[PDB]
Amino acid sequence: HHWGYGKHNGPEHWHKDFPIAKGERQSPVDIDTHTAKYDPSLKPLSVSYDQATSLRILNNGHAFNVEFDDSQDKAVLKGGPLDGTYRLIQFHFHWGSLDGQGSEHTVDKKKYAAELHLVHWNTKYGDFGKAVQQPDGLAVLGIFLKVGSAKPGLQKVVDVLDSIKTKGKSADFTNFDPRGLLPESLDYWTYPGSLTTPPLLECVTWIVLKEPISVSSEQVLKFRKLNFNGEGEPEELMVDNWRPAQPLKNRQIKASFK
Ligand SMILES: [Zn+2]
């Protein structure tokens, strides 16, 4: 009876194994666009993905992770609200059963069809496992997905999902360029928060881009054919793997743009 997204093991149950679920800096949150203050001191974000080395894609029973070689400063995030250099380790998505839900962060209570998280760790802590124990350990770049025109840079991900249908399956996923998943603008909101899955650690600087990317209905429908279960187990479609908005408490959301 491990955590998941169902009626019996979903977000409202997580607190019983992970009491930090009811903590002071939990994610995601609703972004109230009228309350978020423009902070002219915020720098443009620097996304340096030219040398990114993707290695593998994994169905981990909750989502799929595209994994990167983070043994050197190749793909890094810096600038924005960040001090120092943060290395890309993996990306994944959260998505719904229907286009009207799926995102974790919301914008004035609007839910997007899905949300991409590019997860990076602060090199001053030397490895990911150490970084998640620190308040400034991770920087997660959040990008909304809406359903419309296809995102060509996503299709290589969509087309491999067939080979990692079930929990514990993996596939070789080299030479994927995550710049193909970015929107045009790097305007963002930022706030201090947490991992949105257990262990729900309060170690993330969230950077949520204002501009969504568009993907096609066929693309997101392929996400929805994945499975939470393992091979030859009762099929449970991998949908609605998102945590709802959590209380903002004593936090300010800052906008990079006016
Ligand atoms: Zn995530």
- Summarize the annotated binding site for substrate as residue ranges: 196-197
* DSSP H/E element including 116: strand 114-122
- Summarize the annotated binding site as residue ranges: 92, 94, 117, 196-197
C-beta of residue 28 within 8 angstroms of C-beta of residue 196: yes
Distance CA 258, CA 205 (A): 21
**Tokens describing residue 58:** 């994994």
Calculate how far, in angstroms, residue 243's C-alpha sits from the geometric centre of ligand 1.
Answer: 9
DSSP character for 176? -
Resolution (A): 1.5
- Summarize the annotated binding site for Zn(2+) as residue ranges: 92, 94, 117
Q: What are phi and psi of 256, to 5 degrees?
A: -85, -10
125 C-beta neighbours (distance < 10 Å), count: 18
Calculate how far, in angstroms, residue 92's C-alpha sits from the geometric centre of ligand 1.
Answer: 6
- Residues facing 257 on adjacent strands: none
Q: 60, 51, 72: which is closest to 123 by C-alpha? A: 72
Distance CA 103, CA 30 (A): 11
Distance CA 180, CA 176 (A): 9
C-beta of residue 31 within 8 angstroms of C-beta of residue 253: yes
C-beta of residue 94 within 8 angstroms of C-beta of residue 241: yes
**Secondary structure of the chain: what % helix, strand, coil (to 5)?**
15, 30, 55
Calculate how far, in angstroms, residue 117's C-alpha sits from the geometric centre of ligand 1.
Answer: 5
Report the CATH number that the domain containing residue 188 is assigned in CATH: 3.10.200.10
Calculate how far, in angstroms, residue 129's C-alpha sits from the geometric centre of ligand 1.
Answer: 16
Q: 64, 8, 28: which is closest to 200 by C-alpha? A: 28
Domain span at residue 133 reads 1-258
Burial of 116 (0-12, 13-18, 19+ CB in 10 A): buried
Distance CA 37, CA 14 (A): 32
CA angle 81, 83, 86 (to 5 degrees): 95
Experimental method: X-ray
Distance CA 132, CA 41 (A): 26
Burial of 1 (0-12, 13-18, 19+ CB in 10 A): exposed
Q: What b/e sequence results for 220-232 when a residue is b if at least 16 CB atoms lie within 10 Å of its CB, and e otherwise?
A: bebbbebbbbeee
Note if 62 is an active site residue: yes
Q: Pick the catalytic residue: 1, 8, 13, 62? A: 62
**Domain count along the chain:** 1
Query: Where do the H-state alpha helices sit in 57-198?
Result: 128-131, 155-160
